[PDB]
Design a binder for this molecule. Structure first.
Ligand SMILES: *[C@@H]1O[C@H](CO)[C@@H](O[C@@H]2O[C@H](CO)[C@@H](O)[C@H](O)[C@H]2NC(C)=O)[C@H](O)[C@H]1NC(C)=O
Ligand SMILES: *[C@@H]1O[C@H](CO)[C@@H](O)[C@H](O)[C@H]1NC(C)=O
Lengths: 115, 188
């Protein structure tokens, strides 16, 4: 069983930047992030292939956010710039081996784009 | 108007998954038949293949897989304007059909050489097993098959007659369909 522990969230001034980090004990085929806001269900913000070489972002975040993972130890990243106030949510990093990266989730970390 | 033969596809396992099917009666697949293929992720994107007419009543398609691995799975939706005719799945990794070798020429010992149909990072490059057919152009009865698998796609032999040669390969570990034989070069 694979734990997932996010980090790097917190308060960000809008128009600024914010780099998210979520470590996984092992590597995975599917890796994606999921933003979930007050009353708003968790939406797929950014995804990444098995062998990578193909990034998938939500229309609300395309060209804005970037998803990645480091070498050796694998850690899902959700790099974010120009964060809009309506992005305020607990983003969850989730992993998978088929279809949707829904093998694990490991809770998440709250992103609050201040006023 | 109705696909009699369920569609079937093989994948070159780098970029192209070629498909074909058969309807009942003549159909210009390009004018109307719409094939919609998408992979299986979360922000999946829509790709539409423009089909063609292989026979009077049958059709052919060519999906474009930018980079494909062992855990890829496509949703193949054949449309008729606004009438769905067929829905299915496709796994490019079980039905692999490699590319044809090329650049085949000839250089005591006699030298044959060709290109690997794929770059080294591609998985098929590591367990490819070339097979080269040498048949005499003057003597059609004279023919020989040469098994190759060296990373350098070439062959050496040193057996008055005039012979031809053509090579086909296939990735062994992936259980692929024998690729198309390379163009047939000629010499003495
Ligand atoms: C060279 O390749 C040919 C394939 O064309 C091999 O011939 C096959 O051999 C297997 C057994 O090894 C048979 O089951 C097949 O029926 C044969 N097919 C044909 C078309 O001959 C041949 O054995 C290979 N030779 C070497 C030395 O590798
Ligand atoms: C993936 O392949 C499985 C196994 O056949 C199938 O159940 C599933 O529907 C496929 N995914 C699609 C068609 O999106």
């Amino acid at each position: 069983q694979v734990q997932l522990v996010e980090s790097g969230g917190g308060l960000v001034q809008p128009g600024g930047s914010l780099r998210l980090s979520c470590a996984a004990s092992g590597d995975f085929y599917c890796m994606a992030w999921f933003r979930q806001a007050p009353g708003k269900e968790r939406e797929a913000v950014a995804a990444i292939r098995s062998g990578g070489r193909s990034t998938y972002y939500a229309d609300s975040v395309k060209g804005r956010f970037t998803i990645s993972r480091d070498n050796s130890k694998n850690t899902l990243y959700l790099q974010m710039n120009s964060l809009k106030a309506e992005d305020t949510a607990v983003y969850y990093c989730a992993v998978g081996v088929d279809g949707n990266c829904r093998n694990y989730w490991g809770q998440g970390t709250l992103v609050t784009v201040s006023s | 108007m109705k696909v009699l033969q369920e569609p079937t596809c093989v994948s070159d396992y780098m970029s192209i998954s070629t498909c074909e099917w058969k309807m009942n009666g003549p159909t210009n697949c390009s004018t109307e038949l719409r094939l919609l293929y998408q992979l299986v992720f979360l922000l999946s994107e829509a790709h539409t293949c423009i089909p063609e007419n292989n026979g009077g009543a049958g059709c052919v398609c060519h999906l474009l897989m930018d980079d494909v691995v062992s855990a890829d799975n496509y949703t193949l939706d054949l449309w008729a304007g606004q009438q769905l005719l067929w829905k299915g799945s496709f796994k490019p990794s079980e039905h692999v059909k490699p590319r044809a070798p090329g650049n085949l020429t000839v250089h005591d010992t006699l030298l044959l050489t060709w290109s690997n149909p794929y770059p080294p990072d591609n998985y098929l490059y590591n367990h490819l097993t070339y097979a080269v057919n040498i048949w005499s152009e003057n003597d059609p009865a004279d023919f020989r098959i040469y098994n190759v698998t060296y990373l350098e796609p070439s062959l050496r032999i040193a057996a008055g007659i005039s012979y031809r040669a053509r090579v086909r390969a296939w990735a062994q570990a992936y259980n692929t369909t024998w690729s198309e034989w390379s163009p047939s070069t000629k010499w003495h």
